[PDB]
Design a protein around this nucleic acid. Structure first.
Ligand SMILES: [K+]
Ligand SMILES: [K+]
Ligand SMILES: [K+]
Ligand SMILES: [Mg+2]
Ligand SMILES: [Mg+2]
Ligand SMILES: [Mg+2]
Ligand SMILES: [Mg+2]
Length: 76
RNA sequence: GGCUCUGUUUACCAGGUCAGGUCCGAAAGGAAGCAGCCAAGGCAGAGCC
C-alpha cells in the first residue's frame, strides 16, 4: 500500500526539488501521509505555509506522488 | 459539578518547544512557523470533595 511514507523514503534513495519535496511531506500529519486523498484545500494551505511553500508546490508534490503510486500499482 | 489518577482520543481555526522547510540580513545575528512531542481540550473508568 504505497503511501507518502513510502514516497518520502524513495525521495531518500535536487535539494533543487528533493529537499523541498521532503519538506512538504514533513509538514503533514501521519494520517495525511497514510491517506493522501484526505488532503483538500485547508490541509494544503496548512502544509504549504508550514513548509514555506505555495499551495501550487503542494499540488505538484501530490501529483508526482500520484503518478508514482499509479506506476507502483502497475509494476505490481 | 470540581480536583486527582488511569486508559484513550484530537490536521489548521490566539498555549509551549519548535526538527525539516521558509523569511530578513553581506555577515554577525534575527523572525514567523507546519509536523512531532509537551500542555490543553474531548470521551470514559476509579478515587476524593
Ligand atoms: K486523561
Ligand atoms: K509545532
Ligand atoms: K527549522
Ligand atoms: Mg496544534
Ligand atoms: Mg503554537
Ligand atoms: Mg531550522
Ligand atoms: Mg541570504
Amino acid at each position: 500500500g504505497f503511501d507518502l511514507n513510502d514516497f518520502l523514503e524513495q525521495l531518500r534513495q535536487d535539494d533543487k526539488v528533493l529537499v523541498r519535496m521532503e519538506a512538504i511531506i514533513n509538514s503533514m500529519t501521519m494520517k495525511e501521509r497514510a491517506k493522501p486523498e484526505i488532503i483538500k484545500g485547508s490541509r494544503k494551505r496548512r502544509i504549504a505555509a508550514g513548509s514555506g511553500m505555495q499551495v501550487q508546490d503542494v499540488n505538484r508534490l501530490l501529483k508526482q506522488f500520484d503518478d508514482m503510486q499509479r506506476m507502483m500499482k502497475k509494476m505490481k
